[PDB]
């Protein structure tokens, strides 16, 4: 079984990969629709003034909500309001209070991989000698860090952080070696949904990138392959598409 | 490499799985767009008065056209007009003149599997004891038939005929055992695109089937899995979607 984590961007952002639900009610509506479509987790990302109210209503609607934040304070607020998981793009590195909070709360923590050369250059891609190996080592160190803080390992989730200070080539390399990360025995979450690499993969005849909205099929296919290779879950914008993919894989793979 | 065969239904049909391009120019436009999207073959299906003109223009535009017909006469007309492949849903069983025509023409021939209990009940699903094994045996016999007619085996293509006198369960069984059919050493074409089984797989909460247009992601995923398991090609309505899927598989599987 593969978990489907639907993305709910509560920020307003011109460059967004997938819908801006700044408006409380649209956002809530969107979260609900995603759960209805099969998402077992709704990942709300914003700061507190915007996300809290969304997290609160969704949690009140029985939805399993993840808070996508690098700040322990926003996380704590999220938790106080019904969130059941913390999704940290910094893998605990941005906020020293994060681990202790997770140790206090005992809820799942996603440690996403994001190793920048420097703090002022978080998006410059890192020149990796062996991205798979480096990413793995980095993640295991982040696990050690979390554990040392009192977090039960069983609550941890690894995420290779596709496209974060990584090229499309690094991305493909990580996916190809997905089974090696899965082999760490710690659940792996894949977040490729609508990312740049897909825009590039699917560029038009001209050389113009496929629009964000046109990257869902590719995203869905990455979900099926992820499922085939043991991933724990997938983080996506178009829930239906990835759920459809999963149903196919299961129907195919289970056909006696 | 997996061939992408785009569907061009030149009939008018209320129940169509995918667009009705009865109008010469729309049809042509559609065929061209499919080639542009990456389809290496455009499968025109109608009778002669409707398909011929489409086949002729497409072939004049350099497109590799397949004629989807059970009639040797329509096929011959198609060939006279530029078609380069014959797609026969009857596997040569509807028209005794078909094999000799293919032996004369020396172009690829798709032998689709479609075993009905009877002629008057072509759509009643056959009660199979072992669909995979029966389908295989049937196809190999159709190969023998074609060969005996002077057709070079190298020109043959097998197609399990998904959903033709088959249940969704049979369909899934055939796909799961795709590698066994691939092992015949004869190229295999998969035609699952938007079929009923997918409508059922993806039925809504209510129990209402997913609309035809909503079956493309599933179709695309079947394309990726087919690619992974050695299929020769896929026959689809939404070319972009299946091409996208193929690009993903290749990027993933080739990531050193
Ligand atoms: N755990 C995890 N969290 C994330 N949060 C935001 C984005 C970028 O998302 P966007 O495409 O909505 O901007 N990507 C990830 C990711 O890949 N993994
Ligand atoms: N070779 C082959 N030919 C076919 N022709 C028509 C349909 C039904 O197609 P539609 O969905 O456009 O009605 N299916 C096949 C098929 O599965 N394989
Ligand atoms: Mg987004
Ligand atoms: Mg059709």
Curated annotation (Swiss-Prot), chains A, B:
Residue ranges of domain Pterin-binding in the record: 1-247
Annotated binding of (7,8-dihydropterin-6-yl)methyl diphosphate, by residue: 17, 68, 87, 159, 195, 235-237
EC number(s) reported in the record: 2.5.1.15
Domain of life assignment: Bacteria
Activity regulation information from UniProt: Is potently inhibited by the sulfone dapsone and the two sulfonamides sulfamethoxazole and sulfamethoxypyridazine, with Kis in the range of 12 to 32 nM. Is only poorly inhibited by p-aminosalicylate (PAS). The inhibition of DHPS by sulfathiazole antagonizes PAS-mediated growth inhibition and therefore confers resistance to PAS.
Keyword Metal-binding part of the UniProt annotation: yes
Entry annotated with the keyword Magnesium: yes
One BP annotation, GO: tetrahydrofolate biosynthetic process
Pathway, per record: Cofactor biosynthesis; tetrahydrofolate biosynthesis; 7,8-dihydrofolate from 2-amino-4-hydroxy-6-hydroxymethyl-7,8-dihydropteridine diphosphate and 4-aminobenzoate: step 1/2
SUPFAM superfamilies the UniProt entry points to: Dihydropteroate synthetase-like
pH profile of the protein: Optimum pH is 8.
Keyword vocabulary terms for this entry: Folate biosynthesis, Magnesium, Metal-binding, Transferase
Note on cofactor: Magnesium is required for activity, even if it seems to interact primarily with the substrate.
Molecular functions (GO terms): dihydropteroate synthase activity; metal ion binding
InterPro entries: DHP_synth-like, DHP_synth_dom, Dihydropteroate_synth-like_sf, Pterin-binding_dom
Main EC class the enzyme belongs to: transferase
A GO-annotated cellular component: cytosol
Summary of subunit composition and partner proteins: Homodimer.
Homology family: Belongs to the DHPS family.
Function: Catalyzes the condensation of para-aminobenzoate (pABA) with 6-hydroxymethyl-7,8-dihydropterin diphosphate (DHPt-PP) to form 7,8-dihydropteroate (H2Pte), the immediate precursor of folate derivatives.
PANTHER family linked: FOLATE SYNTHESIS PROTEINS (PTHR20941), FOLIC ACID SYNTHESIS PROTEIN FOL1 (PTHR20941:SF1)
Protein's UniProt name: Dihydropteroate synthase
Organism expressing this protein natively: Mycobacterium tuberculosis (strain ATCC 25618 / H37Rv)
Organism lineage: Bacteria, Bacillati, Actinomycetota, Actinomycetes, Mycobacteriales
């Amino acid at each position: 079984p593969v978990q489907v984590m639907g993305v709910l961007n509560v920020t307003d952002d011109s460059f967004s990969d997938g819908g801006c639900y700044l408006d409380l009610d649209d956002a809530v509506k969107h979260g609900l629709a995603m759960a209805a479509a099969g998402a077992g987790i709704v990942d709300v990302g914003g700061e507190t003034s915007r996300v809290i109210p969304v997290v609160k209503e969704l949690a009140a609607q029985g939805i399993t909500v993840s808070i996508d934040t690098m700040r322990a304070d926003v996380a704590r607020a999220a938790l106080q309001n019904g969130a059941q998981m913390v999704n940290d793009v910094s893998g605990g590195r941005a906020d020293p209070a994060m681990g202790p909070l997770l140790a206090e709360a005992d809820v799942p923590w996603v440690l996403m991989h994001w190793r920048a050369v420097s703090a002022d250059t978080p998006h410059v891609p890192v020149r990796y000698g062996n991205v798979v190996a480096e990413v793995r080592a980095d993640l295991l160190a982040s696990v050690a860090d979390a554990v040392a803080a009192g977090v039960d390992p069983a609550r941890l989730v690894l995420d290779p952080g596709l496209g974060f200070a990584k090229t499309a080539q690094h991305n493909w390399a990580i996916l190809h070696a997905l089974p090696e990360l899965v082999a760490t025995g710690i659940p792996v979450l894949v977040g490729a949904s609508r990312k740049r690499f897909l825009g590039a993969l699917l560029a038009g005849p001209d050389g113009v990138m496929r629009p964000t909205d046109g990257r869902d099929t590719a995203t869905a296919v990455i979900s099926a392959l992820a499922a085939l290779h043991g991933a724990w879950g997938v983080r996506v914008h178009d829930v239906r598409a990835s759920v459809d993919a999963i149903k196919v894989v299961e129907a195919w793979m289970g056909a006696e």
